[PDB]
Amino acid sequence: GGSPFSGLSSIAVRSGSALDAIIIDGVHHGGSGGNLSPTFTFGSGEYISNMTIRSGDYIDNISFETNMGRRFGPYGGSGGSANTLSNVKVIQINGSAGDYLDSLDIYYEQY
Amino acid sequence: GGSPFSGLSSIAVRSGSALDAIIIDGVHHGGSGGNLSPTFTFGSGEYISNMTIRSGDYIDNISFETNMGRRFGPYGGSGGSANTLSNVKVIQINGSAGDYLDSLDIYYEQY
Numbered sequence: 753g754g755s756p757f758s759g760l761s762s763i764a765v766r767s768g769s770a771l772d773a774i775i776i777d778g779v780h781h782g783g784s785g786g787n788l789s790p791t792f793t794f795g796s797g798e799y800i801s802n803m804t805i806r807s808g809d810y811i812d813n814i815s816f817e818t819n820m821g822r823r824f825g826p827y828g829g830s831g832g833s834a835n836t837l838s839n840v841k842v843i844q845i846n847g848s849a850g851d852y853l854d855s856l857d858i859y860y861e862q863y
Numbered sequence: 864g865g866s867p868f869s870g871l872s873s874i875a876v877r878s879g880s881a882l883d884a885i886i887i888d889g890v891h892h893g894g895s896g897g898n899l900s901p902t903f904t905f906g907s908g909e910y911i912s913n914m915t916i917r918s919g920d921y922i923d924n925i926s927f928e929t930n931m932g933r934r935f936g937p938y939g940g941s942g943g944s945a946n947t948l949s950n951v952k953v954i955q956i957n958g959s960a961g962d963y964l965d966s967l968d969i970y971y972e973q974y
């Protein structure tokens with residue numbers, strides 16, 4: 753019984769040319785620079801299915817598509833190298849933050 | 864670089880004899896009954912290492928120990944059956960909620 757939920761229930765970012773911050777369920781991870789994205793709130797049974805991430809020494813860009821045809825991004829800049837997650841169910845987003853988003857540790861089901 | 868963080872950054876619950884709610888990074892999952900736990904905010908590099916969960920048709924009790932000797936619980940009641948997670952790193956907490964906490968879908972590293 754019940755309506756499904758996730759502990760990853762909403763995402764925002766702060767971005768300029770790179771990722772200043774990620775804001776996960778209203779919890780700030782990073783610095784104050786860049787401009788604040790609007791918050792993406794996930795629906796019951798909705799999860800991240802695609803995700804493109806540009807990264808270098810820092811997280812430079814973040815975009816994703818959900819299983820419900822919804823989109824978030826791109827936010828950030830054109831630097832670093834691009835990696836893509838496809839046919840996935842993203843479960844967790846961890847990482848390391850300072851004044852910027854230094855790394856991301858994504859946990860997902862690889863379908 | 865950077866200080867580690869998790870997308871599972873704080874836990875509270877609402878509990879009576881069972882689990883009315885779990886509150887994950889300030890996002891409410893469940894109903895309004897029972898009494899509100901105080902919020903456990905996780906520190907950088909802190910994660911759930913032990914966890915005892917009583918469950919039946921509903922989540923009945925929740926307790927956990929973190930890798931930093933910190934504790935949360937027990938909260939709830941004495942019904943259902945007990946399961947324990949030991950030598951783990953909890954990564955995600957999902958589930959299904961209504962007026963109560965119907966299920967929990969825990970994602971962890973089994974060490």
